[PDB]
Amino acid sequence: SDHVDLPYNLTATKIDSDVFVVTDRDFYSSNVLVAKMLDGTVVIVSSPFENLGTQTLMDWVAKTMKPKKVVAINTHFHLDGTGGNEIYKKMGAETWSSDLTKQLRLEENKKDRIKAAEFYKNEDLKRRILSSHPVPADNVFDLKQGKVFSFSNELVEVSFPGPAHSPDNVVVYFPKKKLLFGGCMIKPKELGYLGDANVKAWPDSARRLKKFDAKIVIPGHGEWGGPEMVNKTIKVAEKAVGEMRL
Ligand SMILES: [Cl-]
Ligand SMILES: [Cl-]
Ligand SMILES: [Zn+2]
Ligand SMILES: [Zn+2]
Ligand SMILES: [Zn+2]
Numbered sequence: 001s002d003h004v005d006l007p008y009n010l011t012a013t014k015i016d017s018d019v020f021v022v023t024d025r026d027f028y029s030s031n032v033l034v035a036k037m038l039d040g041t042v043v044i045v046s047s048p049f050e051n052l053g054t055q056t057l058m059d060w061v062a063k064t065m066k067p068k069k070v071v072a073i074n075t076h077f078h079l080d081g082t083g084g085n086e087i088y089k090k091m092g093a094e095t096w097s098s099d100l101t102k103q104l105r106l107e108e109n110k111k112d113r114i115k116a117a118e119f120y121k122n123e124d125l126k127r128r129i130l131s132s133h134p135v136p137a138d139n140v141f142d143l144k145q146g147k148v149f150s151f152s153n154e155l156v157e158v159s160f161p162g163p164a165h166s167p168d169n170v171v172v173y174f175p176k177k178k179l180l181f182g183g184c185m186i187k188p189k190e191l192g193y194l195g196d197a198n199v200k201a202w203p204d205s206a207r208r209l210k211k212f213d214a215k216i217v218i219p220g221h222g223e224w225g226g227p228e229m230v231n232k233t234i235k236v237a238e239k240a241v242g243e244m245r246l
Helices: 051-065 085-090 099-108 113-117 123-131 202-211 230-243
Strands: 010-016 019-022 030-036 041-045 069-073 094-098 139-141 147-151 156-161 169-173 180-181 216-219
Touching: 010 051, 010 216, 019 051, 030 051, 030 180, 030 216, 041 051, 041 147, 051 085, 051 123, 069 085, 085 094, 094 099, 099 139, 113 123, 180 230, 202 230, 216 230
Parallel strands: 041 069, 069 094, 094 139, 180 216
Antiparallel strands: 010 019, 019 030, 030 041, 147 156, 156 169, 169 180
16 A cells, blocks of 8 residues: 555655655645654654644654654745644744745734635634644744755755745755655646736746756645656746736
């Protein structure tokens, strides 16, 4: 069997030695990367949307990886990105995002909760959303400068290719495994939710991802693939630019 099932319909799939994709199937099949470094540090990129999914993920991480330390990197300000911060903190993980991601999270938190919960089209999901209280990351770097983590010389590179799915979207590259977590700016079929998107800039932003020697590219939603994920995304963004007359 090619996956393991967790509570709240999370799925964990192994894509490499020490690398898993955990997918929150209740909330739009949101992908979270979990990569164990050689020195025992567990790096988590993105998050499930809310507290029950995040707690389920961390339970599974503690059990299966026995991390010496966990570092969680928010990819953008949406809930698939910041929705895990509350539980990441409570479970002793070190949470990181860009400054802009933190600011947009704080701004989003001012919006009327009830109205914002209407996006969700099943009552249990709405309830879980309202039951959580998303917070920004505790640690912050400058968006345009990005940040390189070093775990005993194993590098994790976070960088900002430009606005696309959102103004703050960052990618996470692991040069050792040639792994790019492109997040929600990887859209090989259709762009999806446009509420924070910059469609006109998206082709150029995705194009900057081509410099990464990626064996595997992981999107925010749906199945992962190779370097071609980026090229498809550019084609998709460019088609949208055309249809919207931008
Ligand atoms: Cl929110
Ligand atoms: Cl998305
Ligand atoms: Zn199953
Ligand atoms: Zn998003
Ligand atoms: Zn997303």
